[PDB]
């Protein structure tokens, strides 16, 4: 009963007092508080999903089982909110594009520099041009 | 203690790094939120992710370019015995010995 007699009225008074002094942002008026010996419960639920999802890891290349459905059922069985847990189709496309975009720059930078370096060293006269550009000079 | 619990919880997400179904960023934020740490700045901003992508691209570009330049520059330095002498006179070395 000390949760109801002491803890909850303590939080209720503190919320209003900290709001009057602007030490906390104004609450949406739809915020309730439980005094729980909570967030740790949510963490425990999430940790179970990660371990259960890791059990699905060896079967990542399974052509038969719909792994996306199984992950959703596992998350539902735990009881966590599944809003945003599974990637949306446009999100998967964005990850699809980003992976290609990455080595596009990686091979692009590698290919650009090799040709740029090769053309810089094409002829000794052209090599002085690189020196005169960056501020270097041939005759030292 | 809160930070070390997040790292252990996040390290558990490493096996599913290539999972195409689960939004790992959402799980990472939820894990950090459940622990109770301040989430401001722990997640990379979109511009920061772009910068990291550029930096590793520039790492490969400069490193490949430095190798490609030196191989090409060495080839021109040893192209002819006359150009061979030019390299020595440049660095201060001498061909006559």
């Amino acid at each position: 009963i000390l949760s109801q007699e002491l803890q909850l009225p303590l939080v209720r008074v503190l919320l209003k007092q900290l709001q009057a002094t602007q030490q906390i942002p104004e609450l949406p008026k739809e915020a309730v508080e439980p005094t729980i010996s909570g967030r740790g419960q949510d963490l425990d639920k999430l940790e179970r999903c990660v371990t259960a999802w890791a059990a699905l890891a060896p079967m990542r290349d399974d052509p038969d089982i719909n792994l996306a459905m199984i992950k959703l059922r596992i998350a539902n069985a735990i009881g966590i909110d599944t809003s945003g847990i599974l990637l949306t189709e446009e999100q998967k496309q964005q990850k699809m594009a980003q992976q290609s975009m990455q080595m596009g720059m990686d091979n692009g930078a590698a290919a650009l520099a090799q040709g740029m370096a090769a053309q810089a060293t094409a002829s000794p006269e052209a090599m002085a041009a690189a020196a005169d550009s960056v501020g270097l000079q041939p005759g030292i | 203690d809160k930070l070390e619990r997040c790292v252990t919880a996040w390290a558990a997400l490493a096996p599913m790094r290539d999972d195409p179904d689960i939004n790992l960023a959402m799980i990472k934020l939820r894990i950090a939120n459940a622990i109770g740490i301040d989430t401001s700045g722990i997640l990379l901003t979109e511009e920061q992710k772009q910068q990291k992508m550029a930096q590793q691209s520039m790492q490969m570009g400069m490193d490949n370019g430095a190798a490609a330049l030196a191989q090409g520059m060495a080839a021109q330095a040893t192209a002819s015995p006359e150009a061979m002498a030019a390299a020595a006179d440049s660095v201060g070395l001498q061909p006559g010995i």
């Binding site: 000794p124 090599m127 | 030196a70 330095a77 020595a88 440049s90 070395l93």
Partner: peptide
Amino acid sequence: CFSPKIKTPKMDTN
């Protein structure tokens, strides 16, 4: 009329 690379193995110290 110049060559870029350092020459190291046999060149006279000069």
